[PDB]
Amino acid sequence: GLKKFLEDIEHHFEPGGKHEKWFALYEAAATLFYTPGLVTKRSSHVRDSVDLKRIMIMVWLAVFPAMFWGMYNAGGQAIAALNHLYSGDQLAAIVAGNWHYWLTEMLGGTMSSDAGWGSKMLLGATYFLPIYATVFIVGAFWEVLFCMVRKHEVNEGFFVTSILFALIVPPTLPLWQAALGITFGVVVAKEVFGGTGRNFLNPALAGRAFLFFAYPAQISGDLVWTAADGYSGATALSQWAQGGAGALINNATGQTITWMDAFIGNIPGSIGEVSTLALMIGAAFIVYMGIASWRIIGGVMIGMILLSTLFNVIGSDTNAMFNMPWHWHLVLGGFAFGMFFMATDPVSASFTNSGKWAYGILIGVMCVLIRVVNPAYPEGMMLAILFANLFAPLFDHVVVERNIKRRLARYG
């Protein structure tokens, strides 16, 4: 009996118990398996059914289609590149020299060009799962350490941070770098401020920025976005920056990348960003449930469209990024992922309905600005979100000051 066991071993963790120092973990497990069973004390004798557990679990479930398609796409890209490069004995030797490849083969998969969706998804899993496990374990260590030292209770929110961080990195990221990034994100950005609901930056993007600026060689370039040994290939946004729309060609298969390919997700990149369709399907549910901010999403779209069309009208003779339309900006890079799942973080965004529009517009403007007029970086969504996180409070301040003036006028 799980209930009997849980309510029997409770005394070991109460003050004076044999395991009193692990009470936080004990209560975490107890309230994960069963509900608190508490009642109300004051004010409203009846409460809404929603809680942080459901709020976080819904967001966690919203990214499952993106995760699965990302694994499948990573496997397919890797297999295609491997078969493009090597053949016969060379391919056999290459497979024997990589544990991902020979494990895929051992578990019943095939590394040949006629591999199926099962083999491709297995190959994607042998890359995604280790990263996610490392991120989760390392971040949970710090969360539990802080909760024990400051005698708090472990809460939800890292359950989303870990997966979002794991889904926005290249398939080939080293595990120690992943651990360092999650440590930075969890500790420096969130925990020192008091934990969930008390910070001001985005914990997931803060760690990604740490990786970006500390080890740029492993999170940029042509060597990291396809998990094929010895394969070098550019991606869509870089190819556009080089030679316009005509430069979008998949060198592994010699085909031309189309808008439908970019929309569905048949392109290289971060694990979970590629599928705009899957991201839309996931985000629709949480927008309907009232967890995500349609105002923020609309502001992002408005800013992106406005700035992209302004650049299109202005034109340029030497910068090919000036003629990328809004519907191409939408399906490339991490724009969709960021807009749907990272620009909507309730804690880091503005707390006012009017301020949310400005916050989204700023994010959308900055993303396109960094994409176009910044030659160093091909993408700018992470940087734009981190930038707008600094100025959301000022939008809130402006709205609040206008409201206070209205009040002083005896109309509020």
Binding site: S44, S49, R54, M289, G290, G412
Partner: protein
């Protein structure tokens, strides 16, 4: 007309039938000392003393000249005191029908009465405590006036009684009370009501304003926000329709009128309906043989804002016109937080319940989760209709920033104005006490 769009009508089961009937015999009544804001009693009676109706029980140290009187004639049997000897209730056992009487006037002379005479009669009869002052929701000082007196002739609290049914029985008393209020005020009297008709006073400074929409469309706070915004230098008085009827009866017959009509409703009530009771009636005796078996909570007032009626506090409040009863939700569910709740209510759309329009829930007192920090998914904006910033105001209250809360508009709010915000909080904060603490700081600092 003013129409409220942001709000919530709680679909709790057990809606009363709007028909009045005689209630259970009441043998004990009491005055609750902790329901008056900032009150510090000075006892005038001791256990075993006999009292007459409208005889004084205690005064207020912090508000000189205000008297709290007995609702019935009888004997004082208990004087309950809690931690730090704070008075909890003075209990009187009903016996006899002796009373203190006052001056009486004709119906047509009430509008021309003198303000000082009206105030003297009200203070002496103890009916002066029906009024409350925004800000701070305190009994007004006997030497002060206000330009706006707000009469509440509507009720949108869940399971509440319909004011029209009660008023239609006491039309003359209601009109007389409105005339007395028109004489008492220095500006206007605002009669807030719904679209239906009520008896009208013919005085030019008595005005009817219709409000439409869900809760809190019927709150004096909303009425003040829309008709006469309040501040430190603009103070309004609030009073409900039954107290107006009581004032009319007082000035018509020279006798304190302590009859009441309250709504007895809830998921566990066999026959929800309206019952005739008396002020301060014992709720344990009122609900006898009325509830289903099991562990239940008896609430004086609404489930949104009310007092747990247990032990020394088991008596009808001064400002409450209903009694709510519901089960205690002490059950533990296996992965209950992850179920596809068809029988779970929420202002969000994460549960299957919202797909069944018109559904009614057998709600309990359980808290559907543990305490957490605030994650503003925007629930407060769905329920706050006033021109404010709900999330920022609530965060100021949580942080204890009294000055910022005052700037954001804490002075316009009562505990019952944040009941829905407490209801829909994922973090399970209780904002009423935070608001009360902030207001206490503001009042203490002068």
């Amino acid at each position: 007309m003013i129409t409220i769009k942001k709000g919530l009508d709680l679909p709790i089961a057990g809606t009363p039938s709007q028909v009045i009937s005689d209630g259970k015999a009441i043998k004990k009544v009491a005055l609750l000392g902790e329901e008056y804001v900032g009150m510090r009693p000075t006892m005038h009676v001791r256990v075993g003393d006999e009292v007459k109706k409208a005889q004084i029980l205690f005064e207020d140290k912090k508000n000189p000249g205000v008297k709290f009187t007995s609702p019935v004639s009888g004997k004082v049997v208990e004087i309950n005191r809690g931690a730090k000897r704070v008075l909890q209730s003075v209990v009187i056992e009903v016996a006899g029908d002796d009373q203190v009487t006052f001056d009486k006037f004709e119906a047509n002379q009430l509008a021309s009465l003198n303000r000082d005479a009206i105030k003297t009669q009200l203070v002496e009869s103890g009916l002066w405590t029906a009024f409350r002052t925004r800000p701070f929701s305190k009994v007004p000082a006997i030497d002060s006036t206000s330009e706006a007196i707000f009469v509440t002739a509507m009720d949108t609290n869940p399971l509440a009684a319909e004011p029209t049914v009660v008023i239609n029985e006491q039309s003359e008393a209601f009109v007389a009370g409105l005339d007395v209020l028109s004489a008492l005020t220095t500006g206007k009297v605002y009669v807030c009501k719904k679209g239906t008709s009520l008896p009208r006073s013919q005085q030019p400074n008595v005005e009817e304003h219709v409000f439409d929409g869900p809760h809190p469309a019927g709150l004096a706070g909303t009425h003040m926000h829309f008709l006469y915004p309040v501040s430190a230098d603009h103070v309004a008085w609030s009073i409900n329709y039954q107290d107006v009827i009581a004032v009319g009866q007082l000035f018509l017959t020279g006798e304190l009128y302590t009859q009441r009509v309250v709504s007895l409703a809830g998921p566990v009530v066999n026959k929800p309906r309206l019952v005739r009771t008396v002020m301060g009636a014992s709720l344990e005796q009122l609900v006898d043989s009325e509830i289903m078996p099991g562990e239940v909570r008896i609430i004086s007032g609404s489930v949104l804002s009310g007092t747990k009626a247990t032990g020394p506090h088991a008596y009808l409040g001064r400002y409450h016109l209903q009694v709510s009863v519901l089960r205690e939700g002490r059950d533990k569910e296996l992965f209950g937080w992850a179920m596809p709740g068809k029988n779970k209510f929420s202002v969000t759309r994460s549960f299957l319940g919202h797909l069944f329009k018109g559904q009614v829930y057998n709600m309990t007192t359980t808290t559907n989760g543990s305490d957490r920090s605030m994650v503003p998914i925007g629930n407060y904006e769905k329920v706050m209709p006033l021109d404010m910033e709900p999330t920022l105001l609530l965060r100021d209250l949580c942080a204890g920033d009294s000055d910022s809360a005052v700037r954001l508009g804490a002075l316009e709010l009562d505990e019952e104005d944040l009941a829905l915000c407490t209801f829909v909080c994922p973090g399970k904060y209780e904002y009423g006490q935070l608001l009360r603490e902030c207001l206490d700081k503001i009042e203490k600092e002068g």
